[PDB]
């Protein structure tokens, strides 16, 4: 099977895949809580039942994974002009990973 | 070491002798002389005693013999710019550098 669903950005493509994202909202952990994200898989994608749009019905979902909810990155990013160099700011958004239990 | 034999100053520029000792490098040791003893000018004699050194120096520090060897590294580095002053007309500036150069040449083997 294959997949797709959003919640910030439409990153979902691969199978389970273990792949980046955003996070919860109070602080990732590692474990999980078993938060199955909600329907949108183009009926997966694979199998003679390679169904068209998403819902061949309701209740075709996945499950969490909490692949490891952290990460820095850093990007310099600091402007300039011709009579002042604001040169001073960096601001990532943290991030959580995931390995989503397949469709 | 695999026997060395430098100079130290000797007096005669970086580029001037970086020339000469480019012919030497790779083959050599036996070819040392031949291709210096003929190839003309001055720069190319202040190598033909640092080669006779870097050979007797492999018959002392190193027990190696006068037919082997290789000349696996040469380079001429920038010795102190020996400075003075020239007249000219009115005076302005005469930087005049009497420029110099250390030698180091190294022979070893396959």
């Amino acid at each position: 099977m294959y997949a797709v669903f959003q919640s910030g950005g439409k990153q979902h493509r691969v199978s389970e895949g273990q792949t980046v994202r955003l996070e919860k909202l109070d602080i990732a952990t590692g474990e999980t809580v078993e938060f199955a994200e909600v329907l949108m898989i183009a009926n997966g994608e694979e199998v003679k039942i390679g169904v068209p749009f998403v819902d061949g019905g309701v209740i075709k979902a996945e499950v969490v994974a909490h692949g490891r909810g952290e990460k820095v990155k850093i990007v310099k990013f600091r402007r300039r002009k011709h009579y002042r160099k604001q040169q001073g700011h960096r601001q990532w958004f943290t991030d959580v990973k995931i390995t989503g239990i397949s469709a | 070491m695999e026997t060395i034999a430098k100079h130290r100053h000797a007096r005669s520029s970086a580029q001037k002798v970086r020339l000469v000792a480019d012919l030497i490098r790779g083959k050599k040791v036996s070819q040392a002389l031949d291709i210096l003893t003929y190839t003309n000018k001055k720069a190319a004699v202040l190598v033909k005693k640092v080669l006779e050194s870097a050979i007797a120096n492999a018959e002392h520090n190193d027990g190696a013999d006068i037919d082997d060897l290789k000349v696996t590294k040469i380079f001429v580095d920038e010795g102190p710019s020996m400075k003075r002053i020239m007249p000219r007309a009115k005076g302005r500036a005469d930087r005049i550098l009497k420029r110099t150069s250390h030698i180091t040449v190294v022979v070893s083997d396959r």
Binding site: - | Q15, L19, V20, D22, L23, D34, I35, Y38, T39
Partner: protein, 56 residues
């Protein structure tokens, strides 16, 4: 009769391109061990037939 910027290292050698001497291609003579200039004969003592200067 003067430049305006600085002829970078890059160009330092883009004249120098051509120089890097070339050396020889020498031969011996029937009578010296392996000397001989490219035109003058035995350095080893000095001659070609015989009494060139002082020989044998």
């Amino acid at each position: 009769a003067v430049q305006q910027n600085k002829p970078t290292r890059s160009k330092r050698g883009m004249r120098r391109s051509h120089d890097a001497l070339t050396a020889v291609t020498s031969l011996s003579v029937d009578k010296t061990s392996g000397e001989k200039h490219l035109r003058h004969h035995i350095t080893a003592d000095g001659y070609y037939r015989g009494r060139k200067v002082i020989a044998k």
